[PDB]
Design a binder for this molecule. Structure first.
Ligand SMILES: Cc1cnc(Nc2ccc(N3CCN(C)CC3)c(F)c2)nc1Nc1ccc(Cl)c(NS(=O)(=O)C(C)(C)C)c1
Length: 127
């Protein structure tokens, strides 16, 4: 029933970079999704205690959320764009794994994912 610690957002020994693609992922992709009317359920780790979902972290073994992504981007935690893109995809996929088609939370994820895909279609070439 208990919540796990959140995903790591700081690790001094992890090699990391700031690339133009990672800057786009913060300034365009994260910013666009974060301001969306459906962002709020995804802006922090799921509190499975307060939502009374004792099975949540028993089923979702690789949790991810945009609060964590935002911190990772702000801290320049990533090595490359694909690592960050993977975090977004994990977040969406986790939603579809845990919930049912047509559930409000799924509709919310689908709207965010549509925008995500539109923005990453225009990811700049690495300079
Ligand atoms: C990211 C994420 C992924 N998956 C889920 N699943 C989920 C499934 C069932 C429920 N409940 C169904 C109704 N019960 C009375 C309480 C439990 C739930 F709260 C969440 N939750 C997520 N975040 C999240 C964050 C905060 C809120 Cl308040 C919501 N609630 S909600 O999904 O019902 C909605 C956003 C539509 C109000 C979800």
């Amino acid at each position: 029933s208990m919540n796990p610690p959140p995903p790591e957002t700081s690790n001094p020994n992890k090699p990391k970079r700031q690339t133009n693609q990672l800057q786009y992922l913060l300034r365009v992709v994260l910013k666009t999704l974060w301001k969306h009317q459906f962002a709020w359920p995804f802006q922090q780790p799921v509190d499975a205690v307060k939502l009374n979902l004792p099975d949540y972290y028993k089923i979702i073994k690789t949790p991810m959320d945009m609060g964590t992504i935002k911190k990772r981007l702000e801290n320049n935690y990533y090595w490359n764009a694909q690592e960050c893109i993977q975090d977004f995809n994990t977040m969406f996929t986790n939603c579809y794994i845990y919930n049912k088609p047509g559930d409000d939370i799924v509709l919310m994820a689908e709207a965010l994912e549509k925008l995500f895909l539109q923005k990453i279609n225009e990811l700049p070439t690495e300079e």
